[PDB]
């Protein structure tokens, strides 16, 4: 990555710097904020896997629909259930004391997605 | 005094008997323990090391 002209070097520097905004601002923390134990990386990966599993079911149905209104309606119907579950998860994770509690809440949310979310999605897609 | 709280206490006792019949000896929802029974909140949260995204 060393060998390049001035323009290429400047472009590479720009691309690198546009990704370090998270690095620069991590030093500027606020004292009065309400801190919470964050969702762990493995739980994040499990939740994203559950979301991808949901997307696996909906893909043929949404790609075989030629109307944007139907796809938007399908998106809205699932999103209400997902938003209720997300609210439960956010409450129970913000009110968490240790990493065990955060893991418990994330596991409950993932289990809700993998157990009831897929059933609800299948019912919606059968309706469509 | 009996007139004010008769129905309220009947509802409370009915809930108690229902959750005993279902063998629920766990504490109810809105139970706020004293200081000694609570879980202390872990202050030390260390953010992960920042690394550049390869993509």
């Amino acid at each position: 990555v060393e060998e390049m002209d001035t323009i290429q070097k400047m472009n590479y520097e720009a691309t690198v710097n546009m990704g370090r905004q998270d690095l620069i601002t991590r030093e500027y923390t606020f004292y009065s904020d309400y801190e919470f134990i964050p969702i762990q990386e493995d739980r994040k990966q499990q939740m994203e896997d559950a979301l991808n599993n949901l997307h696996k079911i909906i893909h043929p149905t949404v790609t075989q629909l030629k109307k944007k209104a139907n796809v938007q309606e399908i998106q809205d119907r699932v999103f209400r259930k997902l938003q209720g579950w997300e609210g439960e998860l956010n409450t129970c994770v913000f009110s968490a004391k240790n990493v065990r509690d955060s893991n418990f809440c994330a596991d409950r949310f993932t289990n809700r997605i993998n157990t009831e979310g897929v059933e609800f999605v299948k019912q919606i897609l059968r309706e469509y | 005094l009996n007139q004010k709280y008769y129905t309220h206490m009947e509802h409370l006792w009915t809930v108690h008997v229902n959750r005993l019949n279902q063998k629920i000896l766990e504490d109810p929802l809105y139970t706020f323990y004293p200081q000694e029974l609570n879980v202390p909140k872990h202050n030390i949260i260390v953010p992960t090391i920042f690394r550049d995204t390869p993509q």
């Binding site: 409450t91 129970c92 009110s95 004391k97 065990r100 509690d101 418990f104 809440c105 | 108690h16 008997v17 005993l20 019949n21 000896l25 766990e26 504490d27 929802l29 809105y30 139970t31 323990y33 029974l37 879980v39």
Partner: peptide, 28 residues
């Protein structure tokens, strides 16, 4: 709000175990 099961102190169960054998709550 719900108390998580691992953070739940079964105080009701502790009182229940301390009841006499011939008790209306045990009958319930």
């Amino acid at each position: 709000e719900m108390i998580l099961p691992h953070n739940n102190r079964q105080l009701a169960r502790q009182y229940f175990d301390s009841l006499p054998e011939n008790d209306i709550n045990r009958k319930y």
